[PDB]
C-alpha cells in the first residue's frame, strides 16, 4: 500500500505534530482534536473512528446488523461482496474479501459471507461489449439475493474500483444497475473508500464521480495520506436515525473513539488538501494528462490492455494480443517486471500479470512523462527477458 | 492513565520524523526495529494498529499454526467472563462482555467463555486456594465438553483490567499451567493493559511466572502517545509458522508503522535508562499496596486488593454483614464523580473502585491520593447513607 | 382403550395371504395400492411409507423441495409444537416438540423449532380460552417474525395432541392458524396418524375443525393396527408443482408403498359400507361426551375434555383450589394400573388419564367403562387420601 | 429379487398369527421372540419398520453411546459414496448416493463422505492389493481431517448392491478393522441387502470376518413377505446404552410388530431346517460364480465380478481397451428390457448388469440364466455395432 495509502503529498510537508493532549474523553481540559468537517457525499453527516480500514470493516458489520435488528429483522444479517476483492485484513475484512489466501477453505467465509462474480473484463468477458458485462455482473448480484433471502440480506459492499487486486474499473453500466437493485429489493449500501478515499480520481470520493449515495463508507487511509493510522466509518442519516434514535451500545463512539493525535493531523491534511486545491489540479488539471499519457500500450505485444481513470492506472502483461492471452503462470512475468520497475527508476506493483500504478496528487505535467519512459523502458525491457526466456 | 503508563506529560519523543510511509522499502531509520527486553523465549514480534487489531490477527495465527501440523479441527479458542480482549469482531467475540453480543452475530464460531475468578462477587467464603482451582478447573470442564482435539488455545488477561480488577487467588494461574499442557494447547496472555511495568516486572507475565507463546501488546507500547498494536510470539509458534509459512512471511520484516514505532521506540528506551520499571515495583509499588490496604472500617469498603502498580476496592451496604447495594453503579459511578469533583482520578464499573496510576509515582504522591479519596470515602458514606437505602 | 387401531377390537377377517407380494417395477399384479378418495376434500394424490415415523420423515424432503421449485430454496425451515409426537424417526424426534427425545444439540437438527402448545389446562390456569387460543396461535406469527417469512416453509400440528395427553385447542385456536399460514404465505401440513380415520366425529380431524392442509400423513389408523403402513396425502396444490417438472417424487405416486399393506385397502371399505364412522360420529359420540364429561363430584377430576371419539380428564390433589401433586407422575401411573388391574385400559401421561376406544363401540358399552373408571376414581381418590401425598 | 432373499413365491407362513398390536400389556405367543443365527458377538436387536427407519435409529444410539461415555462431541459418522443406506433423511444423508441429498436440506450437519472401492469405475489398472489399501486408508485421511475424537463411526455395506456390486478387493476390510481398532470408533455394517441370507454365509460379516459393533437389518428378514426393520447390537454397545437407558432402556421389552415378526420368524425357522443357506453357500453357489465369471469374449463386458449369492458385470464399447460409453444408461437400461423381453431378471445401475437371485436356486436353473443371459449380451451387442455413440 505504498504511494496508495499516501493520498496527497510526497514528503516534506509539515503538520500540527505532537498535540501533547493524547488520551481521550473525560471532563474538561482538552483542545478538541476530533471536530472534523464534511466535504462528504451529500446526505452523509456523521462518522465513526477506528484504528484502520482493517479496524474499520470490523465495526460496519456490527453496525449494519444492529441496524436491521432494531427494525425487527434479526435476519437481514448477511452481506454480499465480490471475488478477488480486498476488503481489509481484520478477520471480518478477511471474511468480507474474496481473496483466496484469507479464507483458505475453512475458517472463512465465517458464517454470513459468500462472494459474487467480480467485473474483471479482460479475463472473465471474452469479446462482450462493456455495457453488458457490467449489467451481467450487476445482475449476478440480484441472482445471489433471490438465491439467499432478501429478508436474509442486509447490504452490499464494493470499492468503486477494485484496487489491491489489479484495477477492476467497472464497465460504465455496472454502478447504474447496482443502483436500482439496492432500491428494488431495498437493502443497504456501503462503499470502501480505504483506497480511493479522499481524491485519487476525478472528484473527492468515488461516490460523486459514479454518483452513488452510500448508506455508509469507510475511509481510513488517505485521511492522513498515509501519515497516520486512522480508521474511518462515515454513516448516512437513515442508518444513523436508527442506531442513535435507538441505541445505547453505540452512544459511546459519537461520544468518544479514535485518537486525538491521529485526527488533529488529518484535519490539516483535508484542511490543506482543500484550499491549495489539489482536488482540482488533480481532477480538472493533472489527471487527463496521466490517462492520455497512460493507455499508450501502442505496440507492446506483452500489453493487451491499458486502463485507468483519475489518479490510478494499470495494464495487463499478456503473451500475445491476437488471442488476448496470459502467460501459463500469470505472475512470473508480472512479479519479474516489478523489480524491473523498481530497479529502473519508478515504483509500481502487479497483483499477478497486472502492473498497477497508484501515484499521489501534487504530481505535475513533467514528472508524468518520466514514469512513462521509465516504464516504457521497463516494458520494452521485460519484453526480452521473457522471450529470450522460454515462456 | 490506563492506555498510558509511566509518562503523564512534559516528555519529548522523536516527533516529526518526516519519513513516514514505508511498507517494503527501507524503514528509513529502521523504525520497526525494537527490542526483545524481558520477553525471554519470545524473540519475534508482530505489529498492528491497536489491540483490537492484535487479538483479531492473533486468531488467524493459531488456526494457521495447528493446520500445518495436521489438525485443521483444532480451532476453538476460549476466554473468560468479564474479561476484555479488544473491540474488533475477533476480540468482541473473545471478550466476556454481554452488552456487545446480540442475537447470534457474536460470538463468532470457535469461541466460548468460562467461569471467571471473581472471588468477591462469585465466591461466598471458600478459601482462595480452593476458588482458584474450581475457576481454573472450570476450564478443564469446558474442554472435555468439546474435545482436546477440537481446542486450539485459551486466552486470558493476567488480571482483568476492564472488568474492575479481578485478582486470581494465588492458586489459579498455577493450575492453568497444568491443564494447558495436560490437554496440549497454546496460551496467549492479554498484555495490552497489564503490559509494561503496570505490574512490578516488565510484563504482567513475569510476576505470575508463565511462559506464554503469544501475547498482544498495545497502548503501553508508547504510553498512550501513539496508536499501535503489538502481538508477540514464542521461539516455538514462530519456528513452525516459518518452517512452512507463506501468507505470514511478511510481518516480522515488513509491518507496523515507521512513525508510531520510533516514538514507542523512544518510550521504552527511556523506561530502561531511567529505570522506572525498577522504581515502580521494587521501591514504590509496595508502599502503594501496603498503603492501599486500608479499607479499614469503611462500611462501604469490604474488599481491598492489589498487585504491582494497580489496585481497587469494592463498595457495599454493610461491611461485616454480607450485603451490597440494590444496583451498584447507581451508587458506584455516583462515587466516581465524587472522586473527580473532589480531586482524584477514579473510574467505577459501578461498585468496584479502581486506581491505575503511572509508574513515576512518589510516596508523597501516594499519601496524596489517599486522604483525597478518604475524603471521597468519608463523604459518599453519608451521601448514600443519608438516603433511604 | 387403544390407539393406532381405530376400528374393530379383534376377530375381523381381512383378505389375508393374498400373496403375489411384488410391486412397482414390472407390470402390476392386481393393483394393491389403488385407494379411494373417501373425503379428503381437495387432496387427490398420495404417497406411501412404512409407519408414522417413516412417514413424516418424507414430508420434509417434500415440503423443502416444494419451495425449491417455486424459486425460494430458503423457505427451508419448519415449525411445530411442544408436547407433540410426530414420529420417532430422527426428523420425527426433531419435529416432535418433546424434550425427552431431543438428544443434545444433534437433536433438534437445523431448520426446526418449537412453539407454545394450546394446553389450556397446564399452560393456562384461568385465562379465557379464546384469547389463550388466539395468543398461543399468535405465538406462530411471532416465531416466523422471529425467523423470517422468507425463511419459513410450513407448520405442522396434531388436530388434538393425543400424545401430549389430550390437548383440544380452544375453538378460536385453529380458526386463527388458518389465517397465518396465509398472512406469511406458507404451507400447512396436519398430522392425522392418530386423528386420522374417525377418532373424531368425522373421518379425519381436518374435516372436524374445518381447514385445508397442503399435505397430511397417516399410519396405523389406516390398517386399524393390522398392518405396518404409512400414508402421506397431498393437496392438488402441492401436487401440480411436483409433477410440473417431476423426477424425485414422480417415483412413488407411480409406485411406492407395499402390496400386503393394501390390507387397509379393505380396512376402509369395510369401514365405509357398514357406516361405522357414521354411527360413530353422529350417534354414539355425543352420548359419550356429555357422559364422560362428568367429573361430577370427583376431587380427582377438575378438567373434563372430549371430542369425537377421544377424551381425557386431568387428575388433581385438591380441586377446590386447582392443584396437582408434588410429583405428577408418581401418582398418575399409580392409577392406570388401578385401571387394568381394576378392569379398564387407560394410559396416563403422568396425571392426565386418557381413553381412545375403537369406533365400533356401542351405547351399552359406554356406561360399562364409566362406572368402572368411576370405580377406579372413588378408589384411587381415597387410596392416596390416606397417605402423606 | 433384491430385498427378498429366499423362496421365490407360493411358500405359506404363519399368517393370521392372531391379530394384535401389543406393547406394555400382556401378549400372545410371546410375539417378537426371534433367534440369533450366526451374528456371534451380537445378542440383542431393536425391531423397526423399514431399512430406512432402521438405519435411522442406529444413529441416535450411535451418538447416545459416546454421550454416556462422556464424549458429547464424538458425533460424526463416515460413509462411502454411491452407497444406499436408506431413504430416511438419516438414511438419505448417510447414503453416499448423490441425487438423494439435494444440496440444501441434506446432508444434515455432521455427515461427510469418502471414496468407494469402485475398482473398475476408477482405478482399473492399479494392482487390486493396493487399491484396497488406499480405498481403506481413505478413511484415516478423513479422520485425521475431522477429529479422531470428533468421529464416532464408519458405515459401509459389505458391498454396495444399490451401486451394482462393487465388491471391495481382498485387502479392503482388513485395514478397515485395523483402522477401526486404532482411532477408537465403532463399526456399523448394513447387512440389510448383502447379509441376512446371501453370499457364502448367512450375513456377509462372516465371509469378510469382521466384528461389527452395530448392524441394521430389514426387508430380507421376511424374504420380502412383510415390512420389517432391525437394528442388531453389540454387547459392547450394549452394556452401555441400557445402563442408563433413556431412549433405549426398555424398547427391547417390546417393539416391532407382532405380525411382521410372526411371519419372518418362520422365514428363519424354515430357512434353517430346509438348509437353504447350507446348500446356498456350499453347493449351489460356487457353480454360479464359476459361470457368471465367463465374460469370455463379449466386447460389451470387460469384467465379470461376483461373490457368494450375488453378481453383476460391466458393459462397455471395447474391452482390450476398456472403453466405456459416452453416457452409460443411454445403453445400460436399454439392455434391461432386453432381459425381461427374453425371460430373465436383471437390474442395470447405469451400465452394470446386477443379478440378485434367491437361495433356492438349482443347477439346471443356474445353467438356464447363463445361456439366456448370453442370448441378451449377444443380442445387446448387435444393437450398436459402432453407432455414432
Query: Which residues are CB-neighbours of D382 under 8 A, at least 6 positions away?
Result: none
The reply to whether A54 sits in an annotated binding site is: yes
Of C240, C272, C304, the last residue of a domain is: C272
Contacts of B148 in chain D (CB under 8 A): 149
Which chains have 3+ CB pairs within 8 A of C?
A, D
CATH of the domain at B158: 3.40.640.10
Residues B294 and B365 occupy one common structural domain? yes
From the centroid of its chain, how far is CA B344? 23
The reply to whether B253 sits in an annotated binding site is: yes
Query: Which residues are CB-neighbours of C174 under 8 A, at least 6 positions away?
Result: C137, C209, C210, C211
Contact A91 B56 (CB under 8 A): yes
Contacts of C147 in chain A (CB under 8 A): 75
State the Cα–Cα distance between residues C76 and C63, nearest whole angstrom: 8
Considering only CA atoms, give the Rg of chain C: 22
Strand D111-112 and strand D76-78: the pairing is parallel
Output the CA–CA distances (angstroms, integers) from residue D370 to D198, D291, D318, D361, D377, in the order listed. 19, 7, 22, 13, 10
Q: How far is D311 from chain C (nearest CA, A)?
A: 20
Query: A149: which 3 cell numbers?
Result: 433471502
Q: What are phi and psi of A332, to 5 degrees?
A: -75, -45
For an interface test with B, which of D63, D72, D73, D75 has the most B Cβ atoms less than 10 Å from its Cβ? D73
Residues B70 and B110 occupy one common structural domain? yes
State the Cα–Cα distance between residues A155 and B106, nearest whole angstrom: 18
Handedness of CA D168, D174, D177, D179 (dihedral sign): negative
Residues B349 and B316 occupy one common structural domain? yes
Query: Which residues are CB-neighbours of B292 under 8 A, at least 6 positions away?
Result: B304, B306, B311, B313, B355, B370
In a domain, A384, yes or no: no
From the centroid of its chain, how far is CA D208? 13
For Cα atoms A39, A45, A51, give the angle at the middle one, nearest 5 degrees: 85
- For residue D74, the chain B residue with the least C-alpha distance is B147
Considering only CA atoms, give the Rg of chain A: 22
Residues of D with CB under 8 A from a CB of B: 70-74, 144-150
Residues of A with CB under 8 A from a CB of C: 72-75, 146-152
Segments forming the whole domain that contains residue A178 = 46-275
State the Cα–Cα distance between residues D277 and B154, nearest whole angstrom: 60
State the Cα–Cα distance between residues C195 and C202, nearest whole angstrom: 10
State the Cα–Cα distance between residues A356 and A167, nearest whole angstrom: 7
Residue among D12, D13, D89 whose CB faces C90 most closely: D89
Residue among C145, C146, C148 whose CB faces A149 most closely: C148
Of D232, D255, D275, the last residue of a domain is: D275
The DSSP output letter for A360 is: -
Contact B15 A18 (CB under 8 A): yes
Contact B49 A55 (CB under 8 A): yes
In a domain, B241, yes or no: yes
Half-sphere exposure (CA, 13 Å, Cβ side) for C335? 33
The DSSP output letter for B269 is: H
Contact B50 A54 (CB under 8 A): no
Looking up cell 409433477, which residue turns up?
C243
Q: CA nearest A73: which of B102, C148, C154, C152?
A: C148
Q: CA nearest C163: which of C100, C231, C233, C77?
A: C100
Q: What are phi and psi of C299, to 5 degrees?
A: -50, -10
Which chains have 3+ CB pairs within 8 A of A?
B, C
Query: C131: which 3 cell numbers?
Result: 384469547
Looking up cell 480508521, which residue turns up?
A231
**Experimental method, per PDB record:** X-ray
Residues D264 and D292 occupy one common structural domain? no
Which chains have 3+ CB pairs within 8 A of B?
A, D
The secondary structure of C72-109, three-state, reads: CCCCCEEEEEECCCCCCCHHHHHHCECCCCCCCCCCCC
Query: A40: which 3 cell numbers?
Result: 462528504
The reply to whether B51 sits in an annotated binding site is: yes
Which residues are A190's β-sheet partners?
A157, A216
Which chains have 3+ CB pairs within 8 A of D?
B, C
State the DSSP H helix or E strand holding residue D112, giving kind and residue range, or none if neither. strand D111-112
Burial class (CB in 10 A: 0-12, 13-18, 19+), C256: middle
Task: Tell me: cis bond preceding D107? Omega within 30 of 0 counts.
Answer: yes
The reply to whether D380 sits in an annotated binding site is: no
Which residues are B155's β-sheet partners?
B188
Contact C150 A151 (CB under 8 A): yes
Query: Which residues are CB-neighbours of B375 under 8 A, at least 6 positions away?
Result: B342
- For residue C75, the chain A residue with the least C-alpha distance is A149
Any idea of the CA torsion for D325, D328, D331, D335, to the nearest 10 degrees? Answer: 120
Burial class (CB in 10 A: 0-12, 13-18, 19+), C166: buried
Q: CA nearest C311: which of C201, C217, C222, C224?
A: C201
Contacts of D183 in chain B (CB under 8 A): none
**Number of domains chain D is built from:** 2
In a domain, C1, yes or no: no
Relative orientation angle of helices C173-183 and C129-145, to the nearest 10 degrees: 20
- Coil vs helix vs strand at C305: strand
Residues A134 and A222 occupy one common structural domain? yes
Q: CA nearest B175: which of B205, B126, B119, B133?
A: B133
By the 8 A CB rule, do A261 and B226 touch? Answer: yes
Residues C321 and C220 occupy one common structural domain? no
Relative orientation angle of helices A135-146 and A174-184, to the nearest 10 degrees: 20
Contacts of D110 in chain B (CB under 8 A): none
Contact C150 A150 (CB under 8 A): yes
In a domain, C20, yes or no: no
Contact C90 D90 (CB under 8 A): yes
For an interface test with C, which of A75, A114, A142, A185 has the most C Cβ atoms less than 10 Å from its Cβ? A75
State the Cα–Cα distance between residues B74 and B110, nearest whole angstrom: 10
The DSSP output letter for A53 is: S
Burial class (CB in 10 A: 0-12, 13-18, 19+), C185: exposed
By the 8 A CB rule, do B79 and B156 touch? Answer: yes
By the 8 A CB rule, do A56 and A41 touch? Answer: no
State the Cα–Cα distance between residues B333 and B356, nearest whole angstrom: 16
Q: How far is B204 from chain D (nearest CA, A)?
A: 35
State the Cα–Cα distance between residues B233 and B214, nearest whole angstrom: 4
Considering only CA atoms, give the Rg of chain B: 22
Output the CA–CA distances (angstroms, integers) from residue A303 to A317, A319, B318, B327, in the order listed. 5, 8, 82, 71
Handedness of CA C241, C243, C249, C254 (dihedral sign): positive
State the Cα–Cα distance between residues D313 and D300, nearest whole angstrom: 10
Residues D236 and D308 occupy one common structural domain? no
- For residue B68, the chain D residue with the least C-alpha distance is D145
State the Cα–Cα distance between residues B268 and B273, nearest whole angstrom: 9
In a domain, B3, yes or no: no
What are the DSSP E strand ranges found in D206-361? 214-218, 229-234, 301-306, 311-315, 347-348, 352-355
Contacts of B145 in chain D (CB under 8 A): 72-73
- For residue C87, the chain D residue with the least C-alpha distance is D53
Output the CA–CA distances (angstroms, integers) from residue B124 to B74, B134, B332, D13, in the order listed. 36, 13, 21, 73
Output the CA–CA distances (angstroms, integers) from residue C72 to A145, C77, D204, in the order listed. 10, 12, 45
Which residues are D313's β-sheet partners?
D304, D353
CB pairs under 8 A between A and B: 127
CATH of the domain at A314: 3.90.1150.10
Alpha helices in chain C (DSSP H): 52-67, 90-95, 129-145, 173-183, 206-209, 236-243, 264-267, 269-272, 276-278, 285-292, 333-340, 364-383
- For residue D229, the chain C residue with the least C-alpha distance is C50
State the Cα–Cα distance between residues B332 and B315, nearest whole angstrom: 7
Contact D9 C20 (CB under 8 A): yes
State the Cα–Cα distance between residues A304 and D62, nearest whole angstrom: 61
State the DSSP H helix or E strand holding residue D182, giving kind and residue range, or none if neither. helix D174-182
Half-sphere exposure (CA, 13 Å, Cβ side) for A12? 2
State the DSSP H helix or E strand holding residue B65, giving kind and residue range, or none if neither. helix B51-69
State the Cα–Cα distance between residues A376 and B334, nearest whole angstrom: 70
Looking up cell 465380478, which residue turns up?
D305
Preceding-residue numbers of gaps in chain D (C–N over 2.5 Å): none
Half-sphere exposure (CA, 13 Å, Cβ side) for A204? 14
Q: What are phi and psi of B78, to 5 degrees?
A: -135, 145
State the Cα–Cα distance between residues A52 and A50, nearest whole angstrom: 6
Which residues are D233's β-sheet partners?
D44, D214
In a domain, B188, yes or no: yes
The DSSP output letter for B326 is: S
Contacts of A66 in chain B (CB under 8 A): 102
Looking up cell 453357489, which residue turns up?
D285
Residues C371 and C249 occupy one common structural domain? no
Considering only CA atoms, give the Rg of chain D: 22
By the 8 A CB rule, do D67 and C104 touch? Answer: yes
Residues A120 and A184 occupy one common structural domain? yes
Handedness of CA A105, A108, A112, A116 (dihedral sign): negative
Q: How far is C306 from chain D (nearest CA, A)?
A: 25
In a domain, D66, yes or no: yes
- For residue C149, the chain A residue with the least C-alpha distance is A151
State the DSSP H helix or E strand holding residue C47, giving kind and residue range, or none if neither. strand C43-49
Residues D208 and D296 occupy one common structural domain? no
Looking up cell 505535467, which residue turns up?
A365
Looking up cell 482435539, which residue turns up?
B149
Contact D147 B144 (CB under 8 A): no
Q: What are phi and psi of D239, to 5 degrees?
A: -45, -15
Query: C236: which 3 cell numbers?
Result: 392438488
State the Cα–Cα distance between residues C137 and B236, nearest whole angstrom: 60
Of C272, C294, C310, the last residue of a domain is: C272
Contact B147 D144 (CB under 8 A): no
Burial class (CB in 10 A: 0-12, 13-18, 19+), B345: middle
How many H-runs (helices) and E-runs (strands) does chain A carry? Answer: 14, 11
Burial class (CB in 10 A: 0-12, 13-18, 19+), D112: middle
Q: How far is D229 from chain C (nearest CA, A)?
A: 10
In a domain, C71, yes or no: yes
Contact D149 B144 (CB under 8 A): no
Strand order in the sheet with C352-355: C305-306, C311-314, C352-355, C347-348
Query: Which residues are CB-neighbours of A55 under 8 A, at least 6 positions away?
Result: A90, A231, B49, B50, B52, B53, B56, B88
Residues D245 and D315 occupy one common structural domain? no
State the Cα–Cα distance between residues C72 and C187, nearest whole angstrom: 13
Cβ contact A–C (≥3 pairs, < 8 Å):
yes
Looking up cell 425357522, which residue turns up?
D269
Residues A230 and A318 occupy one common structural domain? no
Contacts of D72 in chain B (CB under 8 A): 145
Query: Which residues are CB-neighbours of D206 under 8 A, at least 6 positions away?
Result: D38, D40
What are the DSSP E strand ranges found in chain B? 44-47, 76-78, 111-112, 151-156, 187-189, 216-218, 229-233, 304-306, 311-314, 352-355
Alpha helices in B156-230 (DSSP H): 172-182, 204-208
State the Cα–Cα distance between residues D3 and C383, nearest whole angstrom: 55
Handedness of CA A219, A224, A230, A235 (dihedral sign): negative
Contacts of D71 in chain B (CB under 8 A): 147
The DSSP output letter for B306 is: E
Contacts of D146 in chain B (CB under 8 A): 73
Burial class (CB in 10 A: 0-12, 13-18, 19+), D210: middle
Contacts of C26 in chain D (CB under 8 A): 340
Written as one string, the DSSP assignment of B92-130 is HTTS--TTT--TTSSSPSSEE------HHHH-SS--HHH
Q: CA nearest C315: which of C288, C343, C350?
A: C350
Amino acid at each position: 500500500r505504498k504511494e496508495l495509502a499516501e493520498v496527497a503529498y510526497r514528503q516534506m510537508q509539515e503538520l500540527p505534530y505532537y498535540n501533547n493532549f493524547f488520551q481521550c474523553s473525560h471532563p474538561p481540559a482538552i483542545e478538541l482534536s476530533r471536530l472534523l468537517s464534511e466535504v462528504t457525499p451529500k446526505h452523509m453527516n456523521h462518522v465513526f473512528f477506528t484504528g484502520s480500514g482493517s479496524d474499520s470493516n470490523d465495526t460496519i458489520l456490527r453496525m449494519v446488523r444492529y441496524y436491521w435488528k432494531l427494525l425487527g429483522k434479526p435476519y437481514k444479517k448477511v452481506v454480499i461482496s465480490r471475488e478477488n476483492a480486498y476488503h481489509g485484513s481484520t478477520v471480518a475484512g478477511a471474511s468480507l474479501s474474496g481473496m483466496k489466501a484469507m479464507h483458505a477453505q475453512g475458517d472463512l467465509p465465517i458464517p454470513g459471507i459468500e462472494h459474487i462474480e467480480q467485473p474483471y473484463h479482460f479475463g472473465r468477458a471474452p469479446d462482450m461489449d462493456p455495457a453488458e458485462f457490467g449489467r451481467q455482473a450487476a445482475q449476478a448480484l440480484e441472482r445471489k439475493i433471490d438465491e439467499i433471502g432478501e429478508c436474509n440480506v442486509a447490504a452490499f459492499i464494493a470499492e468503486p474500483i477494485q484496487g489491491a487486486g489489479g484495477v477492476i474499473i467497472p464497465p460504465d453500466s455496472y454502478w447504474p444497475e447496482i443502483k436500482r437493485i439496492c432500491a428494488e429489493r431495498d437493502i443497504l449500501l456501503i462503499v470502501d473508500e480505504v483506497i480511493t478515499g479522499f481524491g485519487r480520481l476525478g472528484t473527492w470520493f468515488g461516490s460523486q464521480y459514479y454518483d452513488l449515495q452510500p448508506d455508509l463508507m469507510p475511509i481510513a487511509k488517505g485521511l492522513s495520506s498515509g501519515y497516520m493510522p486512522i480508521g474511518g466509518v462515515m454513516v448516512s442519516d437513515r442508518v444513523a436515525k436508527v442506531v442513535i434514535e435507538e441505541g445505547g451500545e453505540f452512544f459511546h463512539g459519537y461520544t468518544y473513539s479514535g485518537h486525538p493525535v491521529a485526527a488533529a493531523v488529518a484535519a490539516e491534511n483535508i484542511r490543506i488538501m482543500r484550499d491549495e486545491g489539489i482536488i482540482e489540479r488533480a481532477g480538472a488539471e493533472i489527471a487527463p494528462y496521466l490517462q492520455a499519457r497512460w493507455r499508450e500500450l501502442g505496440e507492446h505485444p506483452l500489453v493487451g490492455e491499458a486502463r485507468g481513470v483519475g489518479m490510478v492506472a494499470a495494464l495487463e502483461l499478456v503473451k500475445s494480443k491476437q488471442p488476448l492471452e496470459r502467460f501459463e503462470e500469470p505472475g512470473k512475468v508480472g512479479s519479474l517486471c516489478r523489480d524491473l520497475s523498481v530497479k529502473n527508476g519508478l515504483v509500481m506493483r502487479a497483483v499477478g500479470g497486472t502492473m498497477i500504478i497508484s501515484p499521489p496528487l501534487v504530481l505535475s505535467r513533467e514528472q508524468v512523462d518520466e514514469l512513462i519512459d521509465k516504464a516504457r523502458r521497463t516494458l520494452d525491457e521485460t519484453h526480452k527477458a521473457i522471450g529470450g526466456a522460454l515462456e
